[PDB]
Amino acid sequence: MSQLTYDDSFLLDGKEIRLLSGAMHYFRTVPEYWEDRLLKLKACGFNTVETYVAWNLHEPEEGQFVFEGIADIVRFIKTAEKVGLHVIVRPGPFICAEWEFGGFPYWLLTVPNIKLRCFNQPYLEKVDAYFDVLFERLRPLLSSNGGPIIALQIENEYGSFGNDQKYLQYLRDGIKKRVGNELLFTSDGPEPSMLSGGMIEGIFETVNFGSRAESAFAQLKQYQPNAPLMCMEFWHGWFDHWGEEHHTRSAESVVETLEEILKQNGSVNFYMAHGGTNFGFYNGANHNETDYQPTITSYDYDGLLTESGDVTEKFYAVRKVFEKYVDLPELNLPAPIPKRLFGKVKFTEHAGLLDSLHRISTPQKSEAPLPMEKYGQAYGFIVYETTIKGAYGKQALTVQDIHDRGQVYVNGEYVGIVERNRGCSRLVVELTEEESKLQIIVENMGRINYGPFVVDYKGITEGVRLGNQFLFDWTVYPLPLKDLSSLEFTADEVKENFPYFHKGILTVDKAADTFIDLSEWTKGVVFVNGHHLGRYWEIGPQQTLYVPAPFLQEGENEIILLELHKHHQSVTFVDTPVLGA
């Protein structure tokens, strides 16, 4: 059986090996396309593919395990094997990655007494149960069992979050028992605090970085002098938050750092080789010390392959470097996947979200506003509703706190938005009627996936108040938008500043990859044949949503667009994306 080990250098199958790995996440590309992307990586000269495992995808509700469709990690890994790649699996359980809640299921948030990523009994119990299932699926795929999985990562970048050695040791032991003799390793940033916090006794360490490999490896060598050098995440690109300029890095730049790595006899994992897409509500977020920053739908990442899988200038540039260091076959790529424009789709039908509540939700009641997790809701929008009795007059309405955006209505009139980034949590309302029906439509814009604010409840965290007076007696409608089939539509009025579903039909001669240009619109999401594309927002830099061909069918296709604020008559399908306005 093959085993990866190391002494001065990595060894596999009786020979020195340099790992040249590419990151690709199964959960970020539709399954129909996994082979295509993997074939492309192999063609570039990678010998390995590396993926995280997304716990939230696999255990969306506790005890409900999902390994189907885009979540079929077994299929993905078998695909890598077919194409001839070694596999590195990075099972977390926290994967960070710019993904909702760093891969943690929303339901962790409601576990009594839980503390994350430390030696905490409730937390470990959950990890153990999940790991028991997950490893059972992975086990046939271990190299020790003849499969392609040669290594696994123990936490992720733990040193950036904590220093709980008991936790790391427990995790190491827990993974060890569920696998074979595969190589176990950690990764961290090349800084003393990170290395001290994140290394585990007896376990190989790797570092992650975007530049300055000599420095990075030198730091690593202070803690781990003799073992082979590996950059487990070479951030050759970067990701975007809404409102940012699109991040790119030149091939020239990438090459310079790659050479630095390789010349030191370094192994490398490109992050991301293929990035793909944060479909649905799966995007992550960050928080700096002041502001919450939601990551965009596209995960193109300035990757070696584009979001839709196209080879790029970086790809050729990297292959050329690889050729200096390993002998490779003649380049042979798959036929490119066609992209088509499909033109304008008119929206002839519309439905107001506030007018559809029982069509797409079931009301729940509570004395105080609770965050959405408490109502059993992971992702999407939630409407909170209460009646105020008495004419209060002019009041300051405060949402304490708003995670992360909401639209406020009084007696069916729009009054404004509250936003997480702050000072922005207050509005002035005028309550002159005997009773006032208050409605707040809240968007979970994505759970934070890195740093100290990761305990990130969504909805309304504590309360809503007028002055200091909290409001009680709520009705709430969780809107995960999983099943829209009960919606009905008219050609009737549409109101600005109220969310509406807009429905249209796209007629397709033959399905092909395409992009929806949403530059005219303001903020929302789109569904194609029930497939949730992700979010759009006029602030950019992304202005199109990728539509994979598999989402489409010959004939009529159902396009449903939920727009939050400003409404228009149509969208247009185009053959190239706008990721960089």
TrEMBL record:
Its EC number is 3.2.1.23. InterPro entries: B-gal_1-like, BetaGal1-like_ABD1, BetaGal_gal-bd, Galactose-bd-like_sf, GH, Gly_Hdrlase_35_cat, Glyco_hydro_35_CS, Glycoside_Hdrlase_35. The active site is at E157 (proton donor), E233 (nucleophile). It catalyses: Hydrolysis of terminal non-reducing beta-D-galactose residues in beta-D-galactosides. This is beta-galactosidase. The keyword Iron does not apply. GO terms for biological process: carbohydrate metabolic process. The keyword Iron does not apply.
